[PDB]
Design an enzyme around this catalytic site. Sequence first.
Site, mmCIF file in Angstrom:
data_model
loop_
_atom_site.group_PDB
_atom_site.id
_atom_site.type_symbol
_atom_site.label_atom_id
_atom_site.label_comp_id
_atom_site.label_asym_id
_atom_site.label_seq_id
_atom_site.Cartn_x
_atom_site.Cartn_y
_atom_site.Cartn_z
ATOM 1 N N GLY A 1 0.811 -1.209 0.000
ATOM 2 C CA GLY A 1 0.000 0.000 0.000
ATOM 3 C C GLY A 1 0.833 1.242 0.000
ATOM 4 N N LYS B 1 4.262 0.060 8.594
ATOM 5 C CA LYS B 1 3.738 1.329 8.097
ATOM 6 C C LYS B 1 4.856 2.366 8.230
ATOM 7 C CE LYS B 1 0.063 4.677 7.917
ATOM 8 N NZ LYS B 1 -1.075 5.457 8.489
ATOM 9 N N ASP C 1 -12.254 9.134 11.153
ATOM 10 C CA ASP C 1 -12.137 8.696 9.774
ATOM 11 C C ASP C 1 -12.562 7.238 9.574
ATOM 12 O OD1 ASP C 1 -11.477 8.991 7.028
ATOM 13 O OD2 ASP C 1 -9.323 8.625 7.386
HETATM 14 C C1 LIG Z 1 -2.868 -0.098 10.499
HETATM 15 O O1 LIG Z 1 -2.169 -0.569 9.357
HETATM 16 C C2 LIG Z 1 -2.327 -1.860 8.997
HETATM 17 C C3 LIG Z 1 -2.318 -2.825 10.011
HETATM 18 C C4 LIG Z 1 -2.458 -4.155 9.646
HETATM 19 C C5 LIG Z 1 -2.557 -4.492 8.297
HETATM 20 N N1 LIG Z 1 -2.720 -5.740 7.699
HETATM 21 C C6 LIG Z 1 -2.786 -5.589 6.403
HETATM 22 N N2 LIG Z 1 -2.913 -6.625 5.558
HETATM 23 C C7 LIG Z 1 -3.056 -6.623 4.172
HETATM 24 C C8 LIG Z 1 -3.166 -7.811 3.448
HETATM 25 C C9 LIG Z 1 -3.354 -7.646 2.079
HETATM 26 C C10 LIG Z 1 -3.477 -8.849 1.171
HETATM 27 F F1 LIG Z 1 -2.536 -8.780 0.200
HETATM 28 F F2 LIG Z 1 -3.121 -10.109 1.885
HETATM 29 C C11 LIG Z 1 -4.779 -8.898 0.398
HETATM 30 C C12 LIG Z 1 -5.038 -7.981 -0.616
HETATM 31 C C13 LIG Z 1 -6.224 -8.015 -1.337
HETATM 32 C C14 LIG Z 1 -7.144 -8.984 -1.027
HETATM 33 F F3 LIG Z 1 -8.319 -9.017 -1.719
HETATM 34 C C15 LIG Z 1 -6.934 -9.914 -0.046
HETATM 35 C C16 LIG Z 1 -5.744 -9.865 0.662
HETATM 36 N N3 LIG Z 1 -3.395 -6.456 1.470
HETATM 37 C C17 LIG Z 1 -3.268 -5.392 2.271
HETATM 38 N N4 LIG Z 1 -3.309 -4.189 1.668
HETATM 39 C C18 LIG Z 1 -3.263 -2.917 2.383
HETATM 40 C C19 LIG Z 1 -4.614 -2.602 2.996
HETATM 41 C C20 LIG Z 1 -4.615 -1.236 3.689
HETATM 42 C C21 LIG Z 1 -4.174 -0.138 2.741
HETATM 43 O O2 LIG Z 1 -4.115 1.117 3.414
HETATM 44 C C22 LIG Z 1 -2.819 -0.460 2.172
HETATM 45 C C23 LIG Z 1 -2.826 -1.807 1.460
HETATM 46 N N5 LIG Z 1 -3.110 -5.407 3.615
HETATM 47 S S1 LIG Z 1 -2.714 -3.949 5.771
HETATM 48 C C24 LIG Z 1 -2.527 -3.419 7.408
HETATM 49 N N6 LIG Z 1 -2.428 -2.128 7.704
#
Ligand SMILES: COc1ccc2nc(Nc3cc(C(F)(F)c4ccc(F)cc4)nc(N[C@H]4CC[C@H](O)CC4)n3)sc2n1
Length: 250
Positions: A16, A37, A128
Site C-alpha cells: 500500500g 507502516k 475517519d
Molecule cells: C494499520 O495498518 C495496517 C495494520 C495491519 C494491516 N494488515 C494488512 N494486511 C493486508 C493484506 C493484504 C493482502 F494482500 F493479503 C490482500 C489484498 C487483497 C485482497 F483481496 C486480499 C488480501 N493487502 C493489504 N493491503 C493494504 C490494505 C490497507 C491499505 O491502506 C494499504 C494496502 N493489507 S494492511 C494493514 N495495515
Amino acid sequence: GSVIDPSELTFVQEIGSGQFGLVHLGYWLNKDKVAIKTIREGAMSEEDFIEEAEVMMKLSHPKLVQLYGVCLEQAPICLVFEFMEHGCLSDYLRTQRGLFAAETLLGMCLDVCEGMAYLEEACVIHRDLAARNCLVGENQVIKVSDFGMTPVKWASPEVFSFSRYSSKSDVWSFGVLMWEVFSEGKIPYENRSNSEVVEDISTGFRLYKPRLASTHVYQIMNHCWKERPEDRPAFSRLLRQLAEIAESGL
Ligand SMILES: COc1ccc2nc(Nc3cc(C(F)(F)c4ccc(F)cc4)nc(N[C@H]4CC[C@H](O)CC4)n3)sc2n1
C-alpha cells in the site's frame, strides 16, 4: 510499547501507498508476519505519528488492530502492526462481491460496532471511520484500524460544516460504512463532488437502500444519518439493535 530495531525487520512486499506513508508485508525477528507502516517524510510529524501508536497500544479489544511496536532509530520511522490476512474491508467486499450472505455482511457490521463501542466508552473519537480503514482477518473477522489520530462522503454534517467531532459523528460514518458493506464495496455518492454531496445531504438525500439490506437494516442506517447528533444512537445501543436483527429481520 516495545521498541523495535530496524535490523529486526524484513521487508517482503510493498502492498500500500497512502498519503501518510507506505505499507509493506514484512517479518519481525524472522518470525512474525507484520504490516509495516512507514511514515511519509514531511507529510506528517514524527511526534504525531508516534503518539498515534502510543494511543493504540493501550486500547485492547478483539475488534481493534494491534501493534508489535515502533521503529524509531532509523528514519523513515515506522509502526509495526500484526498482519491482517485479507487486507482492507472495502477492497475485500469488492473482490468477493456476490459471494456474501446477508448474515455475513451483518456480522461484519457487528464486528466494527463492537470495536467502536469500546472506543466510545474510552472517549476515543475515530474521525475517519470507513470500510477503507477496517481490516479483514481469518474467518472474516473485521478489525477497526487507524483509530489513534488526533473525506466528505463519511462526514456528518456537523463535521463537514463546523468540525464538531464526536462519538456521534463516528456513528454517522458507521452508517456509511454499513452502506459500503451491504452494497458490497460500492463507492458512496460516486462521481459526486464534495459540494454536491453537502448539498444533497443538507437537502435530506441519503444513500439508497442496497439490495442485500433488509428494511430493518436500512432503518438502522437512517438512524445513524439523523441530522442532529443527539438523535443518533450511541454505538453501545447500535450494537444491540444490530444483534437483535441477526435473530429477526435480515
Ligand atoms: C494499520 O495498518 C495496517 C495494520 C495491519 C494491516 N494488515 C494488512 N494486511 C493486508 C493484506 C493484504 C493482502 F494482500 F493479503 C490482500 C489484498 C487483497 C485482497 F483481496 C486480499 C488480501 N493487502 C493489504 N493491503 C493494504 C490494505 C490497507 C491499505 O491502506 C494499504 C494496502 N493489507 S494492511 C494493514 N495495515
